[PDB]
Amino acid sequence: HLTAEEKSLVSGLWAKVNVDEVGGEALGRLLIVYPWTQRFFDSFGDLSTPDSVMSNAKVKAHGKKVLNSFSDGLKNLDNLKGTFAKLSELHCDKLHVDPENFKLLGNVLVCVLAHHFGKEFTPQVQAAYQKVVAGVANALAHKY
Amino acid sequence: VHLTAEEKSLVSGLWAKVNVDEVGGEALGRLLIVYPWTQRFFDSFGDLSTPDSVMSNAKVKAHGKKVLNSFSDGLKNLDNLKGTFAKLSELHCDKLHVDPENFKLLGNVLVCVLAHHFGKEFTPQVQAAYQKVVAGVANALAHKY
Amino acid sequence: VLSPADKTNIKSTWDKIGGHAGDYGGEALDRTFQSFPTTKTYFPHFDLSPGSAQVKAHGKKVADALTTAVAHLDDLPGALSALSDLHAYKLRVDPVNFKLLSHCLLVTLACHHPTEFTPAVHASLDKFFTAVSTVLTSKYR
Amino acid sequence: VLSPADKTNIKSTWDKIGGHAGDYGGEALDRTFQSFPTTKTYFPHFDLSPGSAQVKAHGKKVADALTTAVAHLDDLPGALSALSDLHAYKLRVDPVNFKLLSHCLLVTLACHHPTEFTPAVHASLDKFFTAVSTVLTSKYR
Numbered sequence: 008h009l010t011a012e013e014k015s016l017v018s019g020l021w022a023k024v025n026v027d028e029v030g031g032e033a034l035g036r037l038l039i040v041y042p043w044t045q046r047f048f049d050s051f052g053d054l055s056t057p058d059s060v061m062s063n064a065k066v067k068a069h070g071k072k073v074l075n076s077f078s079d080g081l082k083n084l085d086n087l088k089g090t091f092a093k094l095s096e097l098h099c100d101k102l103h104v105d106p107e108n109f110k111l112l113g114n115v116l117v118c119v120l121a122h123h124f125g126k127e128f129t130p131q132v133q134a135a136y137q138k139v140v141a142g143v144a145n146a147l148a149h150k151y
Numbered sequence: 152v153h154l155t156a157e158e159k160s161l162v163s164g165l166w167a168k169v170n171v172d173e174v175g176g177e178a179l180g181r182l183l184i185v186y187p188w189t190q191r192f193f194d195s196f197g198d199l200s201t202p203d204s205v206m207s208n209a210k211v212k213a214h215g216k217k218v219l220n221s222f223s224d225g226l227k228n229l230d231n232l233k234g235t236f237a238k239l240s241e242l243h244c245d246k247l248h249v250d251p252e253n254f255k256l257l258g259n260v261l262v263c264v265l266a267h268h269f270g271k272e273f274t275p276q277v278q279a280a281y282q283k284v285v286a287g288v289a290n291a292l293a294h295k296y
Numbered sequence: 297v298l299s300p301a302d303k304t305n306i307k308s309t310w311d312k313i314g315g316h317a318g319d320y321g322g323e324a325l326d327r328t329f330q331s332f333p334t335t336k337t338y339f340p341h342f343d344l345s346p347g348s349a350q351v352k353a354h355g356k357k358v359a360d361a362l363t364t365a366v367a368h369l370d371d372l373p374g375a376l377s378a379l380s381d382l383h384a385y386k387l388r389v390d391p392v393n394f395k396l397l398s399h400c401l402l403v404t405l406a407c408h409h410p411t412e413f414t415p416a417v418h419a420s421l422d423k424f425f426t427a428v429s430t431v432l433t434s435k436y437r
Numbered sequence: 438v439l440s441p442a443d444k445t446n447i448k449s450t451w452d453k454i455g456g457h458a459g460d461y462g463g464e465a466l467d468r469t470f471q472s473f474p475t476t477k478t479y480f481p482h483f484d485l486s487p488g489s490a491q492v493k494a495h496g497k498k499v500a501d502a503l504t505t506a507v508a509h510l511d512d513l514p515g516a517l518s519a520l521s522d523l524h525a526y527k528l529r530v531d532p533v534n535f536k537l538l539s540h541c542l543l544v545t546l547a548c549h550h551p552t553e554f555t556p557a558v559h560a561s562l563d564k565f566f567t568a569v570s571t572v573l574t575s576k577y578r
């Protein structure tokens with residue numbers, strides 16, 4: 008339930024997203040800011056400091072998958088349930104990630120967009136992006 | 152991700168024995184006491200200023216019974232919790248502005264009251280089944296936004 | 297904070313539990329694992345089947361820790377420091393899960409001690425389990 | 438626990454925001470209200486339209502409390518005691534809302550100080566706002 012204005016606010020900014028970096032930054036920050044989230048990422052090698060998190064090649068590559076997945080979500084805002092259904096079962100049934108962490112990651116993503124865009128990440132833009140991440144987090148959590 | 156047949160049996164067997172006059176107000180009462188910010192929603196209910204006023208509050212009891220009954224409606228339609236709670240979800244979200252986290256808190260407090268009332272009969276298994284119910288009710292209530 | 301009444305409620309409750317605490321910890325785990333299966337994933341090394349000796353044994357540890365905490369309500373951080381290290385640094389337990397176990401501990405106490413489990417004691421016990429949880433996740437803050 | 442590093446991060450960040458703090462408090466509220474509109478319901482007495490003077494004036498009050506907290510990182514409970522009472526006892530603010538506002542504070546800060554908003558400082562600021570929220574919700578525990 009984003010408005011048309013909100014759709015173009017989101018798309019407007021998203022087109023400017025550094026797709027190679029932003030996902031990794033958001034994931035790195037999640038891992039740093041909420042350290043229990045590292046439990047899911049033992050195969051990722053060194054996450055022992057912020058600097059290793061932020062230089063972790065796999066965090067960067069996987070963060071890029073997470074970002075593309077968001078992009079996926081932005082192209083299917085009228086069907087996030089379907090778009091995220093298998094990832095929902097992945098996260099819930101294989102990975103056992105508590106859904107609260109989807110919200111945190113969404114919000115860290117928002118922090119990273121704010122960081123990257125500054126004044127352009129207006130309260131309105133953020134508002135639109137908050138619906139997207141809520142929609143994504145809810146779509147991901149909809150498999151329990 | 153719903154209840155097994157066995158769990159549905161567990162839930163309805165206990166539910167039949169729930170004191171419909173008391174369990175609702177006791178859960179709502181303990182919610183208001185355990186999570187005092189929830190009183191913000193109940194300014195019209197009069198004295199909630201002590202556990203004793205909460206627990207002897209007639210409007211807490213009467214409302215809790217409506218709440219319990221809405222849970223019974225849920226238990227009578229476990230495969231259509233979305234439909235059963237649509238109107239209530241709009242009420243709570245759009246009109247009451249109750250954060251959905253509190254639906255989960257209330258469901259868990261209800262589980263506590265069920266434990267309290269049934270004791271050993273409220274087995275880990277009966278509990279697990281009830282946790283699905285209250286999560287399902289909370290989720291159905293949350294479905295608005 | 298934990299008021300005199302809170303501490304009174306916690307202590308009198310723990311006293312009523314008396315020698316059942318260990319069993320109750322096992323029951324609380326059992327309740328957690330059944331109600332919130334995702335919590336089982338922290339114990340892949342445990343046999344989680346009914347009657348599990350590991351679950352029983354671990355419930356005593358959890359109960360012991362809680363009993364230690366009851367004895368040190370004015371210093372949960374010191375009393376539980378090793379355990380905060382463990383749960384945050386070693387186990388990396390999602391803070392979410394402490395709510396779940398805390399919930400099942402309340403349920404377990406309500407199941408066994410209907411008389412003690414007044415709204416006021418419920419609230420004090422809640423505060424208690426939340427305070428224990430805060431400390432056990434304190435190495436995330 | 439705010440570590441020396443956290444405290445340094447928080448303080449240098451606050452040094453950096455300087456005379457903007459008030460405006461950022463208002464932006465943070467604006468962001469909260471827009472992103473999480475249920476938060477508006479705590480301010481039925483406020484004009485919440487764009488450029489609201491009440492929101493601006495209130496963001497300044499919120500800013501000032503955070504600025505005070507930043508001066509008293511050792512003793513947030515003591516610094517924010519009056520405000521704990523206000524928020525729990527008078528306002529009955531749902532704990533969830535502190536997380537929303539805290540998030541919006543972080544966002545506001547990230548919007549204005551990209552350079553300062555490193556992962557570590559983000560973590561420290563997060564811990565800061567959560568520590569303030571904890572104190573502001575302490576009369577619930």
Ligand code: HEM
Pocket residue numbers: 044047048050069072073076077094098102104108109110112113143144147
């Ligand atoms: C809420 C937004 C999230 C989105 C959109 C998302 C997306 C994804 C995607 C698309 C994949 C598959 C990547 C691929 O192979 O193509 C994945 C896997 C994974 N996710 Fe997420 N995720 C989210 C949240 C989380 C959180 C919060 C955690 C942990 C706290 C997490 C943990 C994992 C792990 C451990 C994997 C497997 C990574 C690997 O071993 O390669 N996810 N996620």
Ligand code: HEM
Pocket residue numbers: 189192193195214217218221222239243247249253254255257258288289292
């Ligand atoms: C989670 C499961 C819940 C269920 C099944 C439920 C059920 C209901 C029902 C059926 C009504 C309308 C009663 C009537 O027609 O008179 C109602 C109203 C109301 N609910 Fe809920 N409720 C739940 C949770 C909550 C929570 C957590 C809160 C706040 C903490 C809340 C606050 C209210 C308030 C303030 C009213 C209006 C009461 C009045 O002024 O008469 N509810 N609820």
Ligand code: HEM
Pocket residue numbers: 335338339354357358359361362379382383387389393394395397398428429432
């Ligand atoms: C909230 C109150 C809790 C208390 C008082 C507590 C207490 C303890 C204690 C005392 C130990 C050490 C046992 C030993 O030395 O053998 C322990 C370990 C452990 N804890 Fe907790 N814990 C709590 C919460 C949790 C939660 C919420 C989880 C995750 C769902 C958890 C997961 C674990 C695991 C996986 C171990 C290792 C057990 C073993 O390998 O034997 N704990 N806990």
Ligand code: HEM
Pocket residue numbers: 476479480495498499500502503520523524528530534535536538539569570573
């Ligand atoms: C960072 C956390 C927060 C801080 C530092 C803070 C600070 C303050 C301060 C200093 C006041 C007194 C203003 C005055 O005396 O004029 C106040 C009042 C108030 N607060 Fe908060 N607050 C926080 C969180 C919240 C949240 C999360 C809400 C609800 C969403 C909230 C709702 C209110 C309301 C409704 C008032 C009365 C304001 C007025 O009538 O002018 N506060 N807050």
